[PDB]
Amino acid sequence: EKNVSIVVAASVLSSGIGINGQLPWSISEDLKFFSKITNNKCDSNKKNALIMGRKTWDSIGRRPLKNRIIVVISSSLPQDEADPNVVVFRNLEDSIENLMNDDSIENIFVCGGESIYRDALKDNFVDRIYLTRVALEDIEFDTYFPEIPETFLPVYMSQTFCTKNISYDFMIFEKQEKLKSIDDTVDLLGEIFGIRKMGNRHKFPKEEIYNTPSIRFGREHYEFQYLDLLSRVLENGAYRENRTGISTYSIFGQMMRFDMRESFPLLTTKKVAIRSIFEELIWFIKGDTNGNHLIEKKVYIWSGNGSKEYLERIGLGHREENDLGPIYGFQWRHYNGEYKTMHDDYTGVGVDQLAKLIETLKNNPKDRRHILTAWNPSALSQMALPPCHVLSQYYVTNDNCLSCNLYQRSCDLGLGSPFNIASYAILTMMLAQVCGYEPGELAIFIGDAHIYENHLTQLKEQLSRTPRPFPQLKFKRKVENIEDFKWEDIELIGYYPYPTIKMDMAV
Amino acid sequence: EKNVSIVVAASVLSSGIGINGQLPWSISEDLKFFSKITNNKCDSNKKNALIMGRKTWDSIGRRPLKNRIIVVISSSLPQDEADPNVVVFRNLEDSIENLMNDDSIENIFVCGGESIYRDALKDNFVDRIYLTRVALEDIEFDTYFPEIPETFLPVYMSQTFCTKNISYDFMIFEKQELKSIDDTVDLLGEIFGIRKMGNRHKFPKEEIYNTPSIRFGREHYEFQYLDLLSRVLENGAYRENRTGISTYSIFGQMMRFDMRESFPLLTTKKVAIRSIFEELIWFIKGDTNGNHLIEKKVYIWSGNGSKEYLERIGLGHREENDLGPIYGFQWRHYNGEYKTMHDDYTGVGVDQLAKLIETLKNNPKDRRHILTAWNPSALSQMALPPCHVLSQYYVTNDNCLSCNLYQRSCDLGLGSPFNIASYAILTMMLAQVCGYEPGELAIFIGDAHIYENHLTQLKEQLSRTPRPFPQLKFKRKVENIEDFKWEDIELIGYYPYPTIKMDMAV
Ligand SMILES: NC(=O)C1=CN([C@@H]2O[C@H](COP(=O)(O)OP(=O)(O)OC[C@H]3O[C@@H](n4cnc5c(N)ncnc54)[C@H](OP(=O)(O)O)[C@@H]3O)[C@@H](O)[C@H]2O)C=CC1
Ligand SMILES: NC(=O)C1=CN([C@@H]2O[C@H](COP(=O)(O)OP(=O)(O)OC[C@H]3O[C@@H](n4cnc5c(N)ncnc54)[C@H](OP(=O)(O)O)[C@@H]3O)[C@@H](O)[C@H]2O)C=CC1
Ligand SMILES: Nc1nc2[nH]cc(Cc3ccc(C(=O)Nc4cc(C(=O)O)ccc4CC(=O)O)cc3)c2c(=O)[nH]1
Ligand SMILES: Nc1nc2[nH]cc(Cc3ccc(C(=O)Nc4cc(C(=O)O)ccc4CC(=O)O)cc3)c2c(=O)[nH]1
Ligand SMILES: CN(Cc1cnc2nc(N)nc(N)c2n1)c1ccc(C(=O)N[C@@H](CCC(=O)O)C(=O)O)cc1
Ligand SMILES: CN(Cc1cnc2nc(N)nc(N)c2n1)c1ccc(C(=O)N[C@@H](CCC(=O)O)C(=O)O)cc1
Ligand SMILES: O=c1[nH]c(=O)n([C@H]2C[C@H](O)[C@@H](COP(=O)(O)O)O2)cc1F
Ligand SMILES: O=c1[nH]c(=O)n([C@H]2C[C@H](O)[C@@H](COP(=O)(O)O)O2)cc1F
């Protein structure tokens, strides 16, 4: 008995693997993965066997692979014994003569197109699947990878990588069949001390609220940094009241990291309105607090906090309909500026923090003070809503990459959080291009991480969806000033999300 | 064959376990731990055997323990067969008749004082040690727990618990004698070099990992700081800064601390707790006069407040130690027109700390309890921009006050141990004035760095296995938060390692 694994690279939705006798793409890093995963062995005096079909054998030029024995399944190829690195069998069952015989073969790999993939799964020969999901779906396929049967469970999902603006990840599927004393001692201490033991205040989420719970040790995909935060809130969130009529389940002190070098952290478990995120971000940068400029561009996310009824409730009945007051983008461009109304001209007033940030980022990159704040206690009472994303710090690595850290005092995990993840990712990328750097990492530190109680059935639905590789975000042109970005200048490549989920905002 | 474990509660330094035929302390949670750890079994038709010496058998009243069979080692006690829950053997060697025979016993526990402990380790009978370190050392002991032999390695260290202002933790010692996922991740790390984010956050090597045998049981929250040191030494990029001393820096790190059952004061190094407090009360009082700290023998702000340093950053018009509007001037007089350190600022600016205290008790579930120090209109007037920039506070449902701090730049050698204790005390002060209890402390860090002249020092600190945190209690209740004094603070059970000298980069 030995191991039999499948190596395959299929598209993310339709699981396409080929077209016209060749691959639908050209990803060199994926081929290197095929090389290292099929050459990985222990016994130096043994080799691995790679089973493939005839049409696949033709697609690789009918030439052997170094240090590996290729097994071709064909009904016509002559069983020539001249080449010891290439052997031909008449059927897939007989080809698996390496389990009970031929001790020179250590591991077995299946990689031979739809015919061999489907027959290897139907006849129950495969123990493990190495899947490379490619984010390409509006192209033509003629051979597909069969749907993974229910007997397999995912145990690993890598981060999203990029090659020629093509997103792809790497997954491992295992076939289900059926320290030791440290966990017991911790459980006993949790019975003695109830809430006195901090571990009992941060309980690990139950399987029923854990997204794809079979992936236990391989939660590398950074969308899990958000999905696992939802699970931790559903498990430990305290039922609390707030200024709105809608209570939340809240915990305090959480973080989540995202990579921006090889992907863009736009959630795939739900179709996120990327256009509204951008139009809000450019709305901040331009220094604008007029809420009508977003409604004029069909962006209604700031309508609730800018109605005549809401403004009179918080004591701002003297303002216009959508006069949100000095908020994000007024502390960015005119910090400590005497705010009047949304119609006045504030050019030159206040401290232009964003400009000083951009100028400092290229003139002194290793400076430890690249900070953009929005918490002005002298102007909180004039704001329609105090800042949620309060403070952000920026950092230039040695390889000329721009990372970003954000502190968020209050995080609506249902609506605001997916917006804040993408918004500050775009902002860092904008700052990276204007300063001549590359995107780095994104860390978001959260204070009051909460779920509104009317989002429970929606967020539980979102947790039932296994994530997909992140898309790519590229800029079409180089701008001279950061205020010059437009929505047409943004290209979103390879975004194949799950259907959108409607959730109401608590005003 | 079955398992043989030792259960013991010894003091933190001298490993004392008894005095005059009784325990040196009275910790009820420790007895429950002994109860649950000796009753833990699988087979319902089997019992666990507790081996003890005669003097220990007398100390527990010579009465049996429920659901367990007690084995007494004595040379005089009669081998009475009347009680089946109490059996007597003449020596510890003969007593181990439960391993290869007598299948009714599942697990074996040794817990019988110094005489049995020392012979159980000398004759090499013990597979595991359950140690309860108690932070009591200036009392009298007469029986000690023998030094743990080198064949045992720690595999678990719990958080610090508190009982009657007594700190104690729980450790597990073991005697040294997925599958395909780790390989696939390594291969991806060879294909993509620094393109894979995992390679930018490499796990620290064993040579720089504090107590590396504790792999799955790093519960003690001092590891939240020691492991941050390890991550910097592994991935820190050599970078220059405004000082002449370069650092190894990483970006985006955090560490949590408990304040309910302990106080996060580092034990791997004797931290100057008095200087931390006098600086914190100096902030609360709204003071920027750097002489008031030197008058109280606190020299931490001397480097950033000298005539030479102030002229260099363009503040030569200030007095010697006039640090300018810094911490405690943005707390009490935010956006206030700063003049000098001698002027009267009563009533000017926005008093954030006062508004914070009033909001914490009048509206605890409010999500806006924020105390900021980053004022871009006054950065040029400051002798040093704020490192601990923003802090947020949170009132739990059980009336506990937690704290979140964002720190833009963190000197892990000097500033970090100060910032951990400083914001812990501040949260406790806010908790008493508002009528709550201390909760949790989370510190989010931007530029977490180590100065290159701290390398041999911090590597020395990583060689020390941590000890349970001390306790911090206030002797009296104050009416206003500014009224705290150093005499009002009682530090209980602080037994740290010797201090480590490190120079500050000006
Ligand atoms: N993305 C990826 O990971 C991979 C993609 N591909 C792509 O898939 C395409 C090729 O795959 P595909 O079209 O399905 O053809 P196959 O690679 O599956 O090969 C099929 C051939 O194998 C022989 N064969 C298959 N089944 C049997 C059987 N039950 N008994 C005897 N002989 C059998 C036959 O050869 P004969 O004519 O001699 O009878 C048959 O024509 C290409 O585009 C290729 O690039 C291929 C491998 C991997
Ligand atoms: N903190 C903790 O976890 C614990 C603390 N303790 C404390 O320790 C103290 C008691 O320990 P200690 O003073 O060392 O006494 P012991 O509990 O170790 O008991 C010793 C007695 O056991 C018998 N005995 C010991 N060794 C042998 C041997 N090799 N052969 C035959 N008989 C033997 C002898 O009794 P005999 O005279 O009959 O021959 C001896 O006097 C108490 O204060 C107790 O409270 C005890 C247990 C746990
Ligand atoms: N309580 C509270 N008050 C707040 N005031 C201001 C904000 C910011 C904000 C306000 C509204 C939204 C919003 O509707 N988003 C949205 C989310 C999803 C989804 O992600 O499922 C899908 C579609 C949309 C709308 C669209 O279609 O564009 C997002 C962000 C805010 C908040 O989030 N919560
Ligand atoms: N670069 C830089 N600039 C900064 N400006 C202001 C600070 C705050 C600060 C300034 C100085 C210290 C300091 O000397 N601490 C200290 C540490 C140990 C030890 O823990 O081994 C032992 C003794 C002491 C002194 C004592 O004896 O009290 C601590 C904190 C700061 C900084 O830390 N770094
Ligand atoms: C059967 N086949 C089609 C093909 C293409 N991409 C895939 N990608 C994946 N993830 N899995 C597969 N089974 C797979 N198969 C192959 C097999 C080997 C090579 C190949 O050229 N292998 C060289 C790769 C050289 C390299 O660039 O380092 C090797 O050393 O094995 C190409 C296509
Ligand atoms: C031998 N001995 C001394 C003693 C005291 N503290 C210790 N503490 C530790 N960590 N380990 C020991 N071996 C230990 N031994 C004992 C043993 C049992 C009880 C005892 O009363 N046990 C009850 C405890 C009841 C409880 O409070 O729940 C039980 O159910 O086991 C007291 C002292
Ligand atoms: O960017 C935002 N992110 C966010 O999470 N919220 C949510 C958090 C919370 O539900 C509400 C803020 O109300 P409060 O100040 O009371 O926490 O808005 C709002 C934003 F504008
Ligand atoms: O409370 C403090 N914590 C801290 O870590 N520093 C260190 C961080 C850094 O080593 C230096 C500030 O230099 P910079 O302004 O370049 O960050 O002070 C200073 C404090 F006052």
Side-chain angles (χ1 to χ4, degrees), chain A residues 1-45 47-65 67-80 82-92 94-99 102-121 123-176 178-307 309-479 481-485 487-501 503-507, chain B residues 1-65 67-80 82-92 94-99 101-102 104-176 179-204 206 208-239 241-284 286-295 298-306 309-310 313-336 338-478 480-484 486-500 502-506:
Chain A
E1 184 70 15
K2 42 197 72 167
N3 203 263
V4 172
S5 305
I6 274 186
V7 196
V8 62
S11 59
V12 60
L13 304 189
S14 52
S15 305
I17 64 170
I19 173 65
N20 294 324
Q22 62 176 21
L23 303 178
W25 51 76
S26 173
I27 301 175
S28 61
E29 295 89 345
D30 174 48
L31 296 181
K32 290 196 56 185
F33 178 75
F34 180 90
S35 185
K36 302 196 175 188
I37 206 63
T38 56
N39 281 313
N40 190 260
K41 58 181 182 179
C42 288
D43 203 320
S44 174
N45 302 322
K47 295 189 291 186
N48 292 329
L50 313 190
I51 302 178
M52 58 181 58
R54 188 267 300 173
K55 295 186 188 177
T56 292
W57 172 239
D58 305 344
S59 59
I60 65 174
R62 295 206 182 187
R63 282 193 159 77
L65 294 165
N67 305 115
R68 289 156 286 177
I69 294 182
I70 296 184
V71 179
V72 186
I73 304 306
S74 178
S75 60
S76 296
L77 284 186
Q79 292 182 345
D80 164 82
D83 203 338
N85 288 27
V86 171
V87 61
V88 179
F89 285 91
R90 300 297 161 189
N91 61 90
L92 180 62
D94 282 7
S95 70
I96 313 181
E97 62 158 16
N98 317 16
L99 298 182
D102 193 10
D103 303 319
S104 56
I105 295 305
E106 176 167 321
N107 297 115
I108 302 182
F109 294 86
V110 172
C111 34
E114 177 169 354
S115 297
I116 304 303
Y117 283 142
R118 197 171 304 274
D119 289 5
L121 300 173
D123 296 4
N124 201 263
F125 287 137
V126 189
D127 302 331
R128 178 150 58 253
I129 296 180
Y130 295 94
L131 175 62
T132 307
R133 304 190 298 182
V134 183
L136 280 172
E137 273 300 334
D138 283 68
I139 67 188
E140 197 183 342
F141 305 106
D142 66 356
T143 54
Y144 302 83
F145 184 73
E147 184 180 1
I148 304 181
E150 303 173 3
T151 65
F152 286 86
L153 285 182
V155 309
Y156 172 77
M157 178 183 302
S158 69
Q159 72 176 82
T160 300
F161 297 100
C162 181
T163 291
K164 311 177 187 181
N165 297 340
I166 293 179
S167 299
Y168 58 97
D169 60 357
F170 294 91
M171 297 188 60
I172 303 180
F173 288 82
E174 295 270 17
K175 192 185 162 198
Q176 299 298 322
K178 190 61 186 61
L179 206 267
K180 44 184 184 176
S181 61
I182 296 180
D183 290 337
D184 287 6
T185 302
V186 173
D187 291 347
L188 297 182
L189 289 183
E191 291 171 18
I192 299 178
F193 313 94
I195 317 298
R196 301 177 49 193
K197 186 175 181 300
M198 191 166 161
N200 283 114
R201 296 181 251 117
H202 301 269
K203 291 176 183 177
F204 190 84
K206 300 181 299 286
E207 174 165 346
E208 302 183 353
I209 54 173
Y210 208 45
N211 177 279
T212 319
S214 49
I215 307 179
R216 196 155 65 167
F217 303 95
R219 293 186 160 262
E220 175 178 322
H221 186 355
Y222 288 102
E223 188 168 356
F224 288 140
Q225 297 276 315
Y226 167 83
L227 294 178
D228 292 1
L229 177 52
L230 265 45
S231 303
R232 287 194 302 277
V233 168
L234 293 180
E235 182 68 24
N236 308 273
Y239 193 73
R240 308 169 94 249
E241 304 169 338
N242 50 83
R243 53 167 190 85
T244 78
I246 309 178
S247 301
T248 68
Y249 298 86
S250 169
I251 60 179
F252 192 68
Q254 289 292 330
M255 82 159 181
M256 44 187 183
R257 330 182 68 102
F258 298 96
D259 179 41
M260 298 183 303
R261 295 195 178 193
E262 302 284 328
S263 58
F264 177 71
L266 189 64
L267 302 182
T268 60
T269 52
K270 169 189 59 178
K271 186 176 180 176
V272 187
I274 178 62
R275 178 187 154 266
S276 308
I277 298 176
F278 163 82
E279 216 74 46
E280 179 198 28
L281 177 59
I282 194 63
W283 183 64
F284 294 157
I285 299 176
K286 287 180 187 171
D288 198 14
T289 63
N290 191 329
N292 298 284
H293 296 166
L294 296 179
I295 311 175
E296 287 167 15
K297 300 183 183 55
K298 303 189 182 310
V299 177
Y300 316 104
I301 66 172
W302 283 96
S303 300
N305 308 84
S307 56
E309 304 82 21
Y310 171 81
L311 283 180
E312 287 179 1
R313 183 199 317 161
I314 65 178
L316 299 180
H318 60 285
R319 281 184 175 74
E320 270 196 41
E321 169 84 326
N322 288 289
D323 197 337
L324 298 180
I327 52 172
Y328 321 101
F330 191 90
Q331 313 301 324
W332 290 9
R333 313 306 303 273
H334 323 282
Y335 191 94
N336 272 324
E338 194 53 41
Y339 189 86
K340 288 176 49 176
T341 58
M342 60 185 226
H343 302 281
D344 292 281
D345 183 292
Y346 300 96
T347 57
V349 79
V351 173
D352 199 328
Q353 203 166 186
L354 184 54
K356 300 185 66 176
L357 171 67
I358 297 181
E359 216 70 20
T360 314
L361 272 180
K362 34 194 187 184
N363 297 6
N364 188 8
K366 301 191 182 316
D367 187 43
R368 303 180 284 211
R369 300 173 175 98
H370 302 131
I371 289 187
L372 174 65
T373 189
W375 196 259
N376 193 337
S378 298
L380 292 175
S381 54
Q382 298 181 339
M383 300 182 187
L385 189 62
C388 295
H389 41 110
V390 168
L391 192 97
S392 60
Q393 186 187 10
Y394 302 90
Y395 179 100
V396 181
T397 69
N398 281 11
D399 49 338
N400 302 286
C401 282
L402 191 63
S403 294
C404 169
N405 280 6
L406 169 68
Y407 186 86
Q408 193 172 6
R409 62 156 182 87
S410 179
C411 175
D412 178 9
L413 289 175
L415 302 186
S417 188
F419 272 55
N420 289 124
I421 297 169
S423 191
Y424 272 82
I426 298 180
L427 172 57
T428 308
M429 293 178 47
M430 289 177 171
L431 293 174
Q433 181 190 101
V434 181
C435 300
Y437 304 114
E438 299 277 23
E441 292 176 351
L442 173 63
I444 297 179
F445 309 116
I446 303 180
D448 193 319
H450 52 79
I451 293 177
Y452 284 88
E453 59 178 354
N454 54 341
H455 297 169
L456 287 180
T457 49
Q458 290 90 332
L459 290 186
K460 291 179 179 186
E461 162 70 28
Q462 192 175 353
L463 288 177
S464 68
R465 305 170 172 180
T466 294
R468 289 163 181 167
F470 277 145
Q472 297 295 330
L473 193 79
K474 299 303 175 186
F475 293 145
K476 290 185 182 171
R477 68 181 183 95
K478 196 189 189 303
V479 304
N481 204 271
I482 193 173
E483 318 174 12
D484 302 327
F485 277 104
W487 173 236
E488 288 69 33
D489 298 337
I490 279 186
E491 193 174 352
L492 186 67
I493 309 160
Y495 185 49
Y496 301 102
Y498 286 80
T500 175
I501 298 174
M503 292 179 248
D504 307 80
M505 177 193 60
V507 186
Chain B
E1 183 69 15
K2 42 199 73 167
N3 202 263
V4 172
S5 305
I6 274 187
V7 196
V8 62
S11 58
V12 60
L13 305 188
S14 51
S15 305
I17 64 170
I19 174 65
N20 293 323
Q22 62 177 344
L23 303 179
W25 50 75
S26 173
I27 301 175
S28 61
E29 295 89 345
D30 175 48
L31 295 180
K32 289 196 174 61
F33 178 75
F34 180 87
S35 184
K36 301 195 175 300
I37 206 62
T38 56
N39 282 313
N40 191 260
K41 59 181 183 179
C42 288
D43 204 315
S44 298
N45 302 323
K46 294 185 184 185
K47 292 177 168 186
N48 291 330
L50 312 190
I51 302 178
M52 58 181 59
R54 186 196 58 81
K55 295 186 188 177
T56 292
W57 173 238
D58 304 343
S59 59
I60 64 174
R62 294 207 181 187
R63 282 193 158 78
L65 294 165
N67 306 115
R68 289 155 286 177
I69 295 182
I70 296 184
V71 178
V72 186
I73 304 306
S74 179
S75 60
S76 296
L77 284 187
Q79 292 170 351
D80 164 81
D83 203 338
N85 288 27
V86 171
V87 65
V88 179
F89 285 92
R90 300 296 161 189
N91 61 90
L92 180 63
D94 282 8
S95 162
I96 315 278
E97 63 158 17
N98 316 272
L99 297 182
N101 22 11
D102 192 283
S104 56
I105 294 305
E106 177 167 321
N107 297 114
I108 303 182
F109 293 86
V110 172
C111 33
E114 177 168 354
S115 177
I116 305 303
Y117 283 142
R118 197 171 305 275
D119 289 5
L121 300 173
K122 163 190 179 297
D123 295 4
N124 201 263
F125 287 147
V126 189
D127 302 331
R128 178 150 58 252
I129 296 180
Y130 295 93
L131 175 63
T132 307
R133 304 190 298 183
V134 183
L136 276 61
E137 272 299 333
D138 283 68
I139 67 189
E140 197 182 342
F141 305 106
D142 66 356
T143 55
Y144 302 84
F145 184 73
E147 306 297 332
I148 304 181
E150 299 173 354
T151 65
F152 286 86
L153 285 182
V155 310
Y156 172 77
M157 178 183 302
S158 68
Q159 71 176 81
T160 299
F161 297 101
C162 181
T163 291
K164 311 177 187 181
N165 297 339
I166 290 180
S167 299
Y168 57 95
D169 61 357
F170 293 91
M171 297 187 60
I172 304 180
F173 288 82
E174 295 270 18
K175 192 186 162 199
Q176 302 296 140
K179 185 102 166 186
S180 60
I181 296 181
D182 290 338
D183 287 6
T184 302
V185 173
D186 291 347
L187 297 182
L188 289 182
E190 291 171 18
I191 298 178
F192 314 89
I194 314 298
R195 302 178 50 193
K196 185 175 180 300
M197 191 165 161
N199 283 115
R200 297 181 252 118
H201 301 269
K202 284 183 183 178
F203 189 83
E206 174 166 346
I208 54 173
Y209 209 46
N210 177 279
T211 319
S213 48
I214 307 179
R215 193 157 59 167
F216 303 94
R218 292 185 158 261
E219 176 178 322
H220 187 177
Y221 289 104
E222 188 168 356
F223 288 140
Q224 298 277 316
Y225 167 84
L226 295 179
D227 291 0
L228 177 53
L229 264 44
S230 302
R231 288 194 302 276
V232 168
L233 294 180
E234 182 69 24
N235 308 273
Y238 194 73
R239 307 169 93 249
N241 51 84
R242 54 167 191 85
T243 78
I245 309 178
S246 301
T247 67
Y248 296 86
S249 169
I250 61 179
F251 191 66
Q253 290 292 330
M254 82 159 182
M255 44 186 182
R256 330 182 67 101
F257 298 95
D258 180 42
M259 299 183 303
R260 295 197 177 194
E261 302 284 328
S262 58
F263 178 71
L265 188 64
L266 302 182
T267 60
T268 52
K269 169 189 59 178
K270 186 176 180 176
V271 188
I273 179 62
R274 177 187 153 266
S275 308
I276 299 177
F277 164 82
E278 215 73 46
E279 179 197 27
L280 176 59
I281 194 62
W282 182 63
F283 294 156
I284 299 176
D287 197 15
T288 63
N289 191 328
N291 299 284
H292 295 167
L293 297 179
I294 311 175
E295 288 166 16
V298 177
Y299 317 104
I300 66 172
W301 284 97
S302 300
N304 307 84
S306 55
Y309 171 82
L310 283 180
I313 65 178
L315 298 179
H317 61 286
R318 289 184 181 286
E319 270 196 41
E320 168 83 326
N321 288 289
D322 198 338
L323 299 180
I326 51 172
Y327 321 104
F329 190 92
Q330 314 301 324
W331 290 10
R332 313 306 303 273
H333 323 282
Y334 191 85
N335 272 324
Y338 188 86
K339 300 170 183 173
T340 57
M341 63 185 184
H342 301 281
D343 292 281
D344 182 63
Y345 300 98
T346 57
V348 79
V350 173
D351 200 329
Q352 277 191 114
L353 185 55
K355 298 185 72 175
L356 172 67
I357 296 182
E358 221 64 23
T359 314
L360 271 180
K361 33 195 187 185
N362 296 6
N363 188 9
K365 302 191 183 317
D366 188 44
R367 304 181 284 211
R368 300 174 175 99
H369 302 132
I370 289 187
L371 174 66
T372 189
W374 196 260
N375 194 337
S377 297
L379 293 176
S380 54
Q381 298 181 340
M382 300 184 186
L384 189 62
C387 295
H388 41 109
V389 168
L390 193 98
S391 61
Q392 186 186 9
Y393 301 90
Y394 180 92
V395 181
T396 69
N397 281 11
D398 49 338
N399 302 287
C400 281
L401 190 63
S402 294
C403 169
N404 280 6
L405 169 68
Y406 187 85
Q407 193 172 161
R408 61 156 181 86
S409 179
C410 175
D411 179 9
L412 289 176
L414 302 186
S416 188
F418 272 54
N419 288 123
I420 296 169
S422 190
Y423 273 83
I425 298 180
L426 171 58
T427 309
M428 293 177 47
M429 289 177 171
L430 293 174
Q432 181 190 101
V433 181
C434 300
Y436 304 116
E437 298 277 23
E440 292 175 351
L441 173 64
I443 296 179
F444 309 117
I445 304 180
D447 194 319
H449 51 78
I450 293 176
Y451 284 88
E452 58 178 354
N453 54 340
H454 298 170
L455 287 180
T456 49
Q457 290 90 332
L458 289 186
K459 290 181 178 186
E460 163 70 27
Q461 191 175 352
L462 288 176
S463 68
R464 305 170 172 180
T465 294
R467 289 163 181 167
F469 278 147
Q471 296 295 330
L472 193 80
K473 300 304 174 187
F474 294 144
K475 290 184 182 171
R476 68 180 182 94
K477 193 179 192 310
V478 304
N480 203 272
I481 192 173
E482 318 174 12
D483 302 327
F484 277 102
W486 173 237
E487 290 72 36
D488 298 336
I489 279 186
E490 191 177 358
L491 186 67
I492 310 160
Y494 187 49
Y495 301 100
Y497 286 91
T499 175
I500 298 174
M502 291 179 248
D503 307 80
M504 178 193 61
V506 186

